[PDB]
Amino acid sequence: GKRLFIIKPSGFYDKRFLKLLRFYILLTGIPVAIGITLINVFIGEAELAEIPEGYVPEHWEYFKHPIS
Amino acid sequence: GGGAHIEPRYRQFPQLTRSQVIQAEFFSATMWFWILWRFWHDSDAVLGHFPYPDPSQ
Amino acid sequence: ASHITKDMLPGPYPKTPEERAAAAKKYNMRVEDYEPYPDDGTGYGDYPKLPDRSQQERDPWYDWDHPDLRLNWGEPMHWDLDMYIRNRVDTSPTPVNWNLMCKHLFGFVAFMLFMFWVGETYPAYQPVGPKQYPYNNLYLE
Amino acid sequence: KNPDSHGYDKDPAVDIWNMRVVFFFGFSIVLVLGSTFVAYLPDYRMQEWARREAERLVKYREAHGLPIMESNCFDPSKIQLPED
Amino acid sequence: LTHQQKVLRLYKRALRHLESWCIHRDKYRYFACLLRARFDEHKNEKDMVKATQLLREAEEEFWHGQHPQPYIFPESPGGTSYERYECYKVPEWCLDDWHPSEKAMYPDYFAKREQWKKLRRESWEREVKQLQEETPVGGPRTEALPPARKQGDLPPLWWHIVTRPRE
Amino acid sequence: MLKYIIPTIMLMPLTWLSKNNMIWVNSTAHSLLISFTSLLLMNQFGDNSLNFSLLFFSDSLSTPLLILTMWLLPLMLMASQHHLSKENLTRKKLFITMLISLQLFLIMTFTAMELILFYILFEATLVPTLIIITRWGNQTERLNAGLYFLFYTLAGSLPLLVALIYIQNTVGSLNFLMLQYWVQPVHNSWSNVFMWLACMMAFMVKMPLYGLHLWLPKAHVEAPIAGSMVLAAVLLKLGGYGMLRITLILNPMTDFMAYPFIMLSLWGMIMTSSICLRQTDLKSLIAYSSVSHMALVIVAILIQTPWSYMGATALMIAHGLTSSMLFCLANSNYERIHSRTMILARGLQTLLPLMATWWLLASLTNLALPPTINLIGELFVVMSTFSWSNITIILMGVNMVITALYSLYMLIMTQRGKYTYHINNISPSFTRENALMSLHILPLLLLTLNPKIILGPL
Amino acid sequence: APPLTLEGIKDRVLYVLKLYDKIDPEKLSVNSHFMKDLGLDSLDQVEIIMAMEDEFGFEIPDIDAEKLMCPQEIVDYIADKKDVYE
Amino acid sequence: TTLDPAEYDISSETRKAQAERLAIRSRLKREYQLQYYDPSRRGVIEDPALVRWTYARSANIYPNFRPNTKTSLLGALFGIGPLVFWYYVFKTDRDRKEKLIQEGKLDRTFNISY
Amino acid sequence: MMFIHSGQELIISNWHWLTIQTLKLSLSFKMDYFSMMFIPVALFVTWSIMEFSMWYMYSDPNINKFFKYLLLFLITMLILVTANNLFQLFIGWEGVGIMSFLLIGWWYGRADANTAALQAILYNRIGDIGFILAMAWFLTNLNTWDLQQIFMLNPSDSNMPLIGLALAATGKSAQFGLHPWLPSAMEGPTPVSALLHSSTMVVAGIFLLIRFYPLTENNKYIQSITLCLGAITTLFTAMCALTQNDIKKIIAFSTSSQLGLMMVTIGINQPYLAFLHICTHAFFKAMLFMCSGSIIHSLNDEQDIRKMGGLFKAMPFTTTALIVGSLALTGMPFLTGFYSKDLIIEAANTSYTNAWALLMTLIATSFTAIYSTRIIFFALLGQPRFPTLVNINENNPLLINSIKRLLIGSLFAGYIISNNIPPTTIPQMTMPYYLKTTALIVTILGFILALEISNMTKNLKYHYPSNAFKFSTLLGYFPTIMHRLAPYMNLSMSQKSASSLLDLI
Amino acid sequence: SWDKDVYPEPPRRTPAPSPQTSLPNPITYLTKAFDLLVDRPVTLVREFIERQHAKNKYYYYHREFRRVPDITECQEKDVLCMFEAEMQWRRDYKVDQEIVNIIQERLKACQQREGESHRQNCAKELEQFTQVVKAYQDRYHDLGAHYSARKCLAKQKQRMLAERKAAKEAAAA
């Protein structure tokens, strides 16, 4: 009835884009996402105290954190 | 198109919906009723009056 | 790849009629008062022969002005003279050269003296002399 | 450059290869996989170590006799101090 | 501008700045003939210097009495919400870059477009070359013969003839 | 260390050795990988800085600055691709080689362990850059940019080698920065000014003062296709950091004459940004930004008293990106329309809608909205340089005004209706247009989350 | 969105022009040629567009005054301005 | 104030022989639209007034320059001048502020920053 | 409610951003007395505002993104009120100053629209230059910017650090000399200026100074320039209001002169009684504008005060919204802000006041009548005048739903907010005669001179278009020359010299 | 938690209830409500892992250095012996920053802990605080050499001025 014709230059090359981010940026995001929670669930930083550790403690890995 | 639901005016002064104005007018009370308690009970100033400090003695 | 004689050369004059218009028609007849003259105060290399300057000022005015486009949108073929201040400038106002603002901005400057006084309400002025006494004057008790 | 091919970089194939070789190498393996690295990367500029040790040592002096934040010039009468 | 019609551009605006001064709708209307009286006071006399004092002194008494913030007729050379809608502006010839699967929509419309072009595909051989016949040397305002003598296709096609609408 | 120079020189025959057109994707693929190695052993200390070899401490220094240098390489081949596809492969094999041949020294420099490897490698460029400017120019004015780019850079950097060979045999050995543990001062004479003046002015002629910048827009206005080496020459300039290695020491105690370098560049900072407003050529318009809030570091460095180095470091890599990326926009929009004249392109923002938010986030980081690095790199400048004398708040407070009218006028010039005559400009920014324009704003703003990785030692 | 047609513009223009007591409402409407009702040189052509602006209200361009000979000509192009009938 | 700007002046009838001031322009808008209307163009127009707008402005001065008139030796009043001034302002400070930092203590003891 | 029982305000320590030499900046929030009350209000209006736009913008294809642009605005304007870390105040300070550009700049083209942006971001950036001065001064002296610490450890000389603040006050509070920006800040969409000018963006200029109350109570220099400033803002706005022809414009100056009373109240030391004003006021002018929507749109448009007509033609409800609010702003006889404008000139008016503002301010109170009655009498009073075919329909579920909430949440508001407070100060409460209704005393004849002059403007004996008067009045005449000058004396002088004129020579 | 004497705070002083009144209080319909929609999804999960976390216990130690190196060691021109005499001095300038941090936050606990008085209470922090920083920038702050940090070369040449001037040239002392 009363009607017109919308005009837009292109939506396709923009929609064909944003995917290659949003698709890929997750693709290694989500696998990197579990390892930031699961790896912390069963494994966490503890504790203190002290220690003399006999002769000398280990090398680096004095840190308090899962991956640090 | 969309619909005819109201036609325009050639300056025949279009009609109202008849629930348009009454539903509004009940909010002409809320200024005229809520103005009730102004003078009841409060005066132009509720103060107390300075009694001209005459005792300079 | 315009080949020869792209822009202005060593003016202001060599044959004022040779320039406008050989190409670059600023004037039609070589005197429109658009002749590539306006090298006012030379020796400044600024604006050589230049099918160009002092053509008048205050705006392209951007209105109906509709042979085709004629001002700031639609780009008539070649008039260009001076520009780039023209998108932040317009024409004649209603009044002319009245600074009454420096008057009004100084209108309060009258009340600078109203600053040196105070506004203390109680008591009134009551012309006095030595009645003032902001705090105390005579003995305490 | 559109004979109604879609295209990104150049031509038929490796263009399609050339998009996955930028997007995937470019980020999700670096702007993400790498960004993870420094996120929780170990104590930077030995400040983590400092908080506690500039914590413990406060009260040690405050407990027995000692003042706090001396600046006594590192044990004078270790220095002969040339006068003239 | 020919000396004859020079009062019109004043006669157009004269009452124009008036109405923005008056308030009541009759006020404009009541002063109409009353201020209309002054025009024909000398109705028929010389075109030159004799009546040029109807042009000469018209300058003052107009500019004097000017700028009571006139009514601007909103969509117009100036004033609010005139050029307002540019967020469409109808960029005609948006139909080029698509990558179909965006072209599935409006199939009847894509059919119609390529039918318009045939005119502009070849209308030229007599369209352009007639302008080499039409204007002998330095011709002023440049439109073709109004018909183009048989069928104009458009001729001004299509930039002025298909140009952009307003919504 | 060799962890780096060796693969990046190993790159060199990863390219020609390949086949036909596979070349671009071949090297762009690997060239990204090295970035894992880039961080790999780096971002160690921190305190008591890293030196892993005799003549290299790669970067310890808290001037990390090297990670960027390894970014911009496989941002070029995404950048440079446009019109370089139109000549021969054995030449296209060259332009990728010399471009690497640059990238190899910028890893050598910034480490250098010393003064005298710096210099010969500080002058070791200009062989690779000069060859990219003169060939593959556009206009014919390029031939003069070839000379002007020398005859300054080289003009006064010879007085270095007269001075640095004068120190080597005067006090001990300059062989190592990490031993300054004996340094006597410089009191005064009519000889020592020159020493201080010889050990300085060579650096100024790179990061411009308001004098002797006469070359900077000459080379950038007319310069290779993509900004292909114009992205690199916005790395080269800021790399005059080495003044941070000297003026910290090695004549510490002459501030006596500092003032002609303060009031000369401090009134130019309010200046050359203002001669940038009426420019009619766009790649000029950006070239004068690059002077301005770069030349602010020269009043950050000369003043001692950190909170400047807190803020002076963030700036070298502040516009290191923003000022990079703008040359990437003005390139693209030039592919389609072949004038660099700013006026001509108008009536965009309808026809390329996605590239709207690209201009904005660029022109917004000269405005320096508070959260990003930019201000947190400027507001450690103002905090110390205020204490110098209270009056610096005015001029450099004006800088924060004219720069805002400066940026917008570049965007808002591309919001207008223009349909006008262009039948060109069809391409709706094929991915590379928006891919290489990213990998800037994503990594840039990001750092604000943990912005202790850009800071000096102080 | 407001519906517009070509009838009202033949009516409205017919309407107020038939409202003025200076014109008898037996006179021609669509074509009078207006030169019979042009009297005089002024106070007609610019006079008649003084009112017709009061209803639609776009600007009534100057150079479009000389199109006003034909009473079908005025209504003719007002269709082309406001995007009127198909 | 800026300016009259002369919206009326003398005229009438002299300089009515001045015509073809429009013939100058009318030629072009005929030719320009003769340019601007064509089916196959797809590209910008030369527009020489712009070519002669920049190129007679940016370049083409130091070529035209001569170091002669002492209104072109003016710039010493402009370029160098205030640059000496800013030295005169500062060098007094940074000293007046310094002398007090030695004899007498202006600051407080809770200022560690700096 | 949790606060209006036990007090107990809070902050938060959360998340350490970089820690440099000594001062350690992380982030926080502030629950303080300005946080507890205001924030519910600024959300409560904006609760009702989007519905209006939801009808107004209903046909715009980009609507989806509009509410995005309008959303961040509320977000970041909301972090200004809540932050106790002085830097953090500056994140949202400029976060909003950019949002103006991206809204006023809604319509492209329209050579005025996008040049109303370049105004907004020009004048704020000057008004920026101050607040980075008092950001510097605290370090070199106090070695922190924390709003807690300054107030615990008091500065002696605030003279320089504070005057900087009074300058950034005037940038966003639309004071005099920076004012020309508002009247041209209206060129965008209507619900924009509803949001921009009511409870937000114009409040920060006089908001920020309030937060500084504990330190600013001393040092008469501070107090002095304030009331020697804000009072003057009024009568240059008032004297520029009259004769102006647009619905939107007059409603722009109305809020321009609402400021002069606020900033005065900082001048005399009245920290809280200043801020209660905005809490109340904001309920007005959102309604007042949002009322005019159905007037502008459903009339297909005018937004001229000419061609309006009378009170009742199918506008029964909206015209009741005007005459309630547009009455309320007139000095609050029993209504909402009865505790706002009314408790000022009756309290701080007993003080050391300059004995000019008393003359000056109370005169501005008069024009508060003719502000209203003018745009009432041309729109709601005279005979209908406007072209035929007017389609007006006010039956609009997505509109009537919006007004009804405010006016209800209007009348009761002023008393609820005020009735519940811990009292923070001592008002004089002994107010002698002739100091008492002296505001109301003026408005009483305002309405007199409103209607008598209205009829004397229109209904009078035909006082002719007599060409001779002085109008420096309807223009303001400052926007005439300067904006013809500042882009001359600078752009074309210190550039065209500095340009290729020199660098190439 | 933390170390008590590292972060001392005054005790709680819980306020007494004062119902006094016959009217309903809504908080008791919330603190009795809100508690029941919180504890279940919240406290059960923290207890859930904290036992789930009983399966493994790591270690990270308390790093304490070995101090032989002194300030008067050793040679004038020397490198080896004066490489370390900063490592003593550099860490001990990273400490004395933070001890200003800790003492500063303790100050804030003098205010919003109280904030009404702000004056007649705390007895300590402020009157102490400006006796702390005045023990800071003197001799522990190399200024304006702070850019170079001038470690141990200028560190003792303030403190030569703090010797070769004070205590002798003081005239007469």
XYZ file of N, CA, C and O in Angstrom, chain H residues 7-105:
396
model
N 26.403 48.458 2.041
C 25.263 47.837 1.377
C 24.500 48.802 0.474
O 23.500 48.401 -0.129
N 24.945 50.055 0.387
C 24.512 51.022 -0.615
C 25.695 51.927 -0.940
O 26.559 52.148 -0.088
N 25.733 52.430 -2.169
C 26.809 53.315 -2.616
C 26.305 54.118 -3.811
O 25.114 54.107 -4.130
N 27.215 54.819 -4.469
C 26.885 55.558 -5.677
C 26.710 54.585 -6.837
O 27.201 53.450 -6.797
N 25.995 55.023 -7.867
C 25.722 54.226 -9.061
C 25.102 55.150 -10.109
O 25.118 56.375 -9.952
N 24.588 54.570 -11.199
C 23.445 55.199 -11.856
C 23.649 56.594 -12.457
O 23.516 57.577 -11.735
N 23.993 56.721 -13.741
C 24.033 55.631 -14.712
C 25.427 55.224 -15.164
O 25.562 54.364 -16.035
N 26.458 55.865 -14.623
C 27.801 55.624 -15.124
C 28.199 54.167 -14.906
O 27.651 53.462 -14.055
N 29.151 53.715 -15.720
C 29.626 52.331 -15.717
C 28.528 51.348 -16.105
O 28.582 50.171 -15.749
N 27.524 51.816 -16.835
C 26.630 50.895 -17.518
C 27.217 50.444 -18.853
O 26.592 49.649 -19.564
N 28.410 50.929 -19.198
C 29.203 50.410 -20.303
C 30.068 49.238 -19.895
O 30.794 48.700 -20.735
N 29.984 48.825 -18.633
C 30.919 47.897 -18.001
C 30.571 46.453 -18.314
O 31.221 45.528 -17.828
N 29.581 46.225 -19.173
C 28.943 44.923 -19.222
C 29.912 43.862 -19.731
O 31.070 44.135 -20.060
N 29.412 42.629 -19.786
C 30.234 41.441 -20.001
C 31.202 41.220 -18.839
O 32.256 40.605 -18.994
N 30.849 41.729 -17.663
C 31.413 41.146 -16.457
C 30.805 39.776 -16.188
O 31.460 38.926 -15.576
N 29.563 39.560 -16.635
C 28.904 38.261 -16.616
C 29.326 37.370 -17.772
O 29.478 36.162 -17.580
N 29.505 37.935 -18.969
C 30.021 37.152 -20.080
C 31.293 36.418 -19.705
O 31.516 35.306 -20.191
N 32.126 37.012 -18.850
C 33.261 36.276 -18.316
C 32.785 35.008 -17.628
O 33.192 33.903 -18.005
N 31.901 35.130 -16.640
C 31.414 33.968 -15.908
C 30.407 33.145 -16.690
O 30.453 31.912 -16.624
N 29.508 33.788 -17.438
C 28.491 33.042 -18.162
C 29.094 32.080 -19.160
O 28.498 31.033 -19.430
N 30.251 32.419 -19.721
C 30.947 31.475 -20.577
C 31.193 30.161 -19.855
O 30.923 29.082 -20.398
N 31.680 30.231 -18.617
C 32.130 29.025 -17.939
C 30.964 28.160 -17.493
O 30.916 26.969 -17.813
N 30.007 28.736 -16.765
C 28.882 27.940 -16.289
C 28.133 27.302 -17.450
O 27.488 26.260 -17.283
N 28.212 27.904 -18.633
C 27.831 27.176 -19.830
C 28.813 26.045 -20.098
O 28.411 24.886 -20.232
N 30.107 26.358 -20.142
C 31.109 25.332 -20.401
C 31.228 24.341 -19.249
O 31.388 23.139 -19.487
N 31.153 24.823 -18.006
C 31.231 23.936 -16.849
C 30.105 22.911 -16.859
O 30.348 21.711 -16.714
N 28.865 23.357 -17.026
C 27.770 22.414 -17.188
C 27.882 21.637 -18.483
O 27.416 20.495 -18.544
N 28.490 22.224 -19.514
C 28.861 21.441 -20.684
C 29.876 20.372 -20.317
O 29.839 19.265 -20.861
N 30.790 20.688 -19.409
C 31.583 19.653 -18.770
C 30.710 18.764 -17.900
O 30.634 17.552 -18.117
N 30.000 19.366 -16.942
C 29.457 18.597 -15.827
C 28.328 17.669 -16.245
O 28.146 16.613 -15.629
N 27.582 18.003 -17.288
C 26.613 17.039 -17.795
C 27.289 16.265 -18.910
O 27.540 16.801 -19.991
N 27.634 15.016 -18.634
C 27.986 14.045 -19.655
C 27.646 12.672 -19.114
O 27.680 12.472 -17.897
N 27.272 11.735 -19.958
C 26.909 10.414 -19.448
C 28.083 9.705 -18.808
O 27.983 9.226 -17.677
N 29.214 9.665 -19.493
C 30.354 8.886 -19.034
C 31.433 9.863 -18.593
O 32.089 10.504 -19.413
N 31.598 9.984 -17.282
C 32.689 10.751 -16.700
C 33.351 9.999 -15.558
O 34.472 9.512 -15.707
N 32.654 9.859 -14.438
C 33.154 9.213 -13.233
C 34.533 9.757 -12.852
O 35.554 9.080 -12.943
N 34.535 11.014 -12.441
C 35.763 11.590 -11.938
C 35.627 13.070 -11.682
O 34.750 13.754 -12.215
N 36.556 13.553 -10.881
C 36.608 14.936 -10.450
C 37.004 15.836 -11.616
O 37.488 15.385 -12.656
N 36.764 17.128 -11.447
C 37.026 18.120 -12.473
C 38.282 18.896 -12.097
O 38.639 19.018 -10.925
N 38.985 19.390 -13.124
C 40.243 20.108 -12.938
C 40.104 21.269 -11.962
O 40.819 21.325 -10.957
N 39.203 22.208 -12.241
C 38.968 23.330 -11.340
C 40.262 24.088 -11.084
O 40.838 23.979 -9.996
N 40.750 24.848 -12.054
C 42.103 25.400 -11.958
C 42.262 26.364 -10.799
O 43.305 26.357 -10.141
N 41.238 27.169 -10.513
C 41.303 28.115 -9.404
C 41.732 27.484 -8.100
O 42.209 28.193 -7.216
N 41.512 26.192 -7.932
C 42.062 25.499 -6.786
C 43.518 25.120 -6.978
O 44.302 25.239 -6.035
N 43.902 24.677 -8.176
C 45.313 24.401 -8.429
C 46.145 25.651 -8.213
O 47.212 25.603 -7.600
N 45.662 26.787 -8.681
C 46.360 28.045 -8.466
C 46.091 28.643 -7.093
O 46.601 29.723 -6.797
N 45.255 28.004 -6.284
C 44.977 28.428 -4.916
C 46.026 27.988 -3.911
O 46.443 28.792 -3.074
N 46.426 26.721 -3.935
C 47.499 26.244 -3.077
C 48.879 26.541 -3.634
O 49.729 27.094 -2.932
N 49.101 26.220 -4.902
C 50.431 26.280 -5.480
C 50.950 27.700 -5.601
O 52.158 27.890 -5.734
N 50.073 28.693 -5.585
C 50.484 30.083 -5.487
C 50.504 30.560 -4.048
O 50.659 31.758 -3.797
N 50.301 29.649 -3.104
C 50.252 29.968 -1.688
C 51.325 29.249 -0.888
O 52.117 29.897 -0.200
N 51.342 27.920 -0.910
C 52.340 27.191 -0.139
C 53.715 27.349 -0.762
O 54.580 28.039 -0.218
N 53.928 26.755 -1.930
C 55.162 26.988 -2.657
C 55.069 28.365 -3.302
O 54.139 29.127 -3.035
N 56.039 28.712 -4.139
C 56.002 29.952 -4.911
C 55.960 31.195 -4.034
O 55.252 32.152 -4.343
N 56.700 31.199 -2.929
C 56.996 32.422 -2.208
C 58.494 32.603 -1.987
O 59.067 33.608 -2.417
N 59.146 31.663 -1.322
C 60.595 31.736 -1.196
C 61.225 31.892 -2.573
O 62.250 32.572 -2.699
N 60.671 31.292 -3.630
C 61.037 31.736 -4.977
C 60.740 33.199 -5.240
O 61.608 33.908 -5.754
N 59.559 33.688 -4.890
C 59.213 35.081 -5.092
C 59.850 36.018 -4.088
O 59.843 37.228 -4.307
N 60.389 35.496 -3.000
C 60.803 36.334 -1.891
C 61.995 37.193 -2.276
O 62.781 36.825 -3.150
N 62.118 38.359 -1.633
C 63.401 39.049 -1.602
C 63.623 39.637 -0.216
O 62.685 40.154 0.393
N 64.844 39.573 0.313
C 65.080 39.877 1.726
C 65.318 41.353 1.960
O 66.229 41.747 2.688
N 64.474 42.187 1.374
C 64.884 43.570 1.190
C 64.088 44.505 2.075
O 64.611 45.035 3.059
N 62.830 44.718 1.723
C 62.022 45.650 2.469
C 62.096 45.317 3.948
O 62.105 44.154 4.354
N 62.223 46.360 4.749
C 62.407 46.200 6.175
C 61.081 45.972 6.865
O 61.030 45.924 8.097
N 60.003 45.868 6.092
C 58.776 45.237 6.546
C 58.802 43.723 6.356
O 57.925 43.035 6.882
N 59.758 43.191 5.585
C 60.085 41.771 5.614
C 61.255 41.427 6.526
O 61.524 40.241 6.732
N 61.983 42.421 7.034
C 62.849 42.268 8.191
C 62.101 42.579 9.462
O 62.704 42.641 10.535
N 60.801 42.822 9.333
C 59.892 42.944 10.457
C 60.022 41.806 11.453
O 60.075 42.061 12.660
N 60.082 40.565 10.967
C 59.865 39.371 11.768
C 60.711 39.272 13.015
O 60.313 38.575 13.952
N 61.862 39.940 13.047
C 62.616 40.011 14.288
C 61.773 40.598 15.404
O 61.984 40.277 16.577
N 60.825 41.459 15.066
C 59.862 41.919 16.047
C 58.852 40.839 16.409
O 58.158 40.977 17.421
N 58.760 39.779 15.612
C 57.779 38.718 15.794
C 58.416 37.399 16.187
O 58.101 36.858 17.251
N 59.274 36.845 15.338
C 59.825 35.524 15.573
C 60.735 35.393 16.775
O 60.436 34.620 17.685
N 61.833 36.150 16.817
C 62.747 36.032 17.950
C 62.247 36.738 19.192
O 62.530 36.284 20.305
N 61.478 37.803 19.043
C 61.283 38.729 20.125
C 60.780 38.098 21.405
O 61.486 38.088 22.414
N 59.589 37.491 21.384
C 59.024 36.992 22.638
C 59.784 35.815 23.163
O 59.667 35.488 24.348
N 60.576 35.180 22.308
C 61.388 34.055 22.734
C 62.502 34.507 23.665
O 62.973 33.723 24.493
N 62.937 35.764 23.545
C 63.810 36.314 24.570
C 63.018 36.577 25.824
O 63.455 36.246 26.931
N 61.836 37.163 25.667
C 60.983 37.466 26.802
C 60.785 36.254 27.698
O 61.051 36.324 28.901
N 60.341 35.127 27.134
C 60.124 33.954 27.970
C 61.379 33.521 28.691
O 61.284 32.862 29.729
N 62.551 33.868 28.181
C 63.708 33.599 29.006
C 63.780 34.568 30.167
O 64.106 34.162 31.287
N 63.465 35.840 29.926
C 63.529 36.828 30.995
C 62.560 36.503 32.122
O 62.897 36.689 33.294
N 61.365 36.008 31.789
C 60.389 35.650 32.813
C 60.901 34.497 33.652
O 60.981 34.584 34.880
N 61.253 33.399 32.999
C 61.646 32.210 33.733
C 62.889 32.454 34.567
O 62.835 32.344 35.792
N 63.996 32.837 33.939
C 65.273 32.797 34.637
C 65.250 33.569 35.948
O 66.032 33.249 36.848
N 64.365 34.559 36.085
C 64.168 35.185 37.385
C 63.544 34.214 38.369
O 64.083 34.008 39.460
N 62.447 33.573 37.984
C 61.967 32.449 38.761
C 62.957 31.309 38.611
O 64.001 31.447 37.972
N 62.664 30.190 39.263
C 63.593 29.069 39.297
C 64.835 29.485 40.080
O 65.640 28.644 40.486
N 64.963 30.789 40.329
C 65.965 31.401 41.187
C 65.360 32.031 42.421
O 65.709 31.637 43.533
N 64.480 33.016 42.246
C 63.695 33.529 43.358
C 63.073 32.398 44.157
O 63.010 32.458 45.388
N 62.608 31.359 43.469
C 62.104 30.184 44.158
C 63.232 29.356 44.757
O 63.017 28.639 45.740
N 64.435 29.449 44.188
C 65.555 28.657 44.680
C 66.171 29.248 45.936
O 66.420 28.517 46.899
N 66.425 30.558 45.936
C 67.020 31.211 47.096
C 66.275 30.875 48.378
O 66.895 30.578 49.404
N 64.944 30.909 48.339
C 64.181 30.593 49.536
C 64.291 29.134 49.933
O 64.212 28.835 51.126
N 64.484 28.222 48.980
C 64.576 26.808 49.339
C 65.813 26.507 50.167
O 65.916 25.419 50.743
N 66.754 27.444 50.248
C 67.981 27.251 51.011
C 67.867 27.877 52.395
O 67.741 27.170 53.400
N 67.905 29.204 52.459
C 67.665 29.930 53.698
C 66.162 30.042 53.907
O 65.456 30.609 53.069
N 65.677 29.495 55.010
C 64.252 29.410 55.235
C 63.635 28.233 54.501
O 64.119 27.776 53.472
N 62.540 27.728 55.058
C 61.838 26.575 54.501
C 60.413 27.037 54.221
O 59.635 27.257 55.151
